[PDB]
Amino acid sequence: IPEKLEYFINKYAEHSHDKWSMDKLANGWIYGEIYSDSSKIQPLMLLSEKEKEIYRWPIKESLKTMLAWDLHAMAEMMAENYHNIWAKKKKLELESKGGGNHPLLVPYDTLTAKEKAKDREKAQDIFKFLQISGYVVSRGXXXXXXXXXXXXXXXXXXXXXXXXXXX
Numbered sequence: 366i367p368e369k370l371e372y373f374i375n376k377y378a379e380h381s382h383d384k385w386s387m388d389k390l391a392n393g394w395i396y397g398e399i400y401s402d403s404s405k406i407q408p409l410m411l412l413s414e415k416e417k418e419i420y421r422w423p424i425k426e427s428l429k430t431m432l433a434w435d436l437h438a439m440a441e442m443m444a445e446n447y448h449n450i451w452a453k454k455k456k457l458e459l460e461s462k463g464g465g466n467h468p469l470l471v472p473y474d475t476l477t478a479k480e481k482a483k484d485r486e487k488a489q490d491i492f493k494f495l496q497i498s499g500y501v502v503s504r505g506x507x508x509x510x511x512x513x514x515x516x517x518x519x520x521x522x523x524x525x526x527x528x529x530x531x532x
Contacts, residue, residue, distance in 0.1 A: 370428055370500075377494050378421040385412070420487070423450075427491060435503040436496070440488050442504070445473050447484035 389410065397406035400413070409417050430446055431439070448469075455467055469480060495502065 366425055366428060366432075371425075373498065374421075374425060374428075377424065377491075378418075380494065381420065381490070382417070423447075424491060426450075431502065434505065436492070438504045439502060440485065440492055443488040443492070444481060444485045447487060448473060448476070448480065451484075 389412075393405060394407060394410040395405070396408060396410040398408045399406055400408065402411055407413075427443055427446070430443070434442065452469060456470055459465075459467065469476065473481075
C-alpha cells in the first residue's frame with residue numbers, strides 16, 4: 366500500500382459516502398438513533414456502523430491485488446476477484462455449517478450475466494476514481510513481432526530440413 370494511495374483511500378471513501386448520501390436523500394433517509402427499516406430511520410444518515418465501511422474495507426485489498434498481480438482487463442480481473450472472495454467466503458462457511466448447494470459454486474466462466482455485472486459495478490465505481498486521479502495502470506508492432514517469431518521458427522525448420530536433405 367503506497368503512501369499517496371493510502372492517503373487517497375480516506376478521500377475516496379468519503380467520496381463514495383457522498384455518492385451514497387445523494388442516493389439516500391433521493392430515497393429519503395433522516396438520522397435517528399433507533400434502528401429500523403419500515404420507519405425509515407437510521408443512525409448513520411439501512412447502512413449501519415460497520416455496514417458503512419464494509420465497502421470501504423476491500424478498497425485497500427483491491428489495491429493490494431493490483432500491486433501483486435488494459436483498463437478493461439483489470440476491470441474484469443477485479444470483477445473476478447470481487448466474486449472469487451465472495452465464493453471463498455461462501456464455500457468455507459457452507460463447509461463449516463453443512464448447508465445446501467449454492468448455484469454460484471462454479472468457475473467464473475460459467476456464471477450468469479447478472480452475477481458478473483453485480484461486481485463489475487463496484488469494479489468500475491472504484492476504477493473511475495483511480496482514473497480521474499491520474500493513476501495509469503495496466504495488467505502488469507505486435508503483428509511485426511509475430512511475423513518475426515514465425516520467421517525464426519521457419520529458420521529453425523529450414524535448419525532441420527537442411528539436416529534432413531543432407532541425409
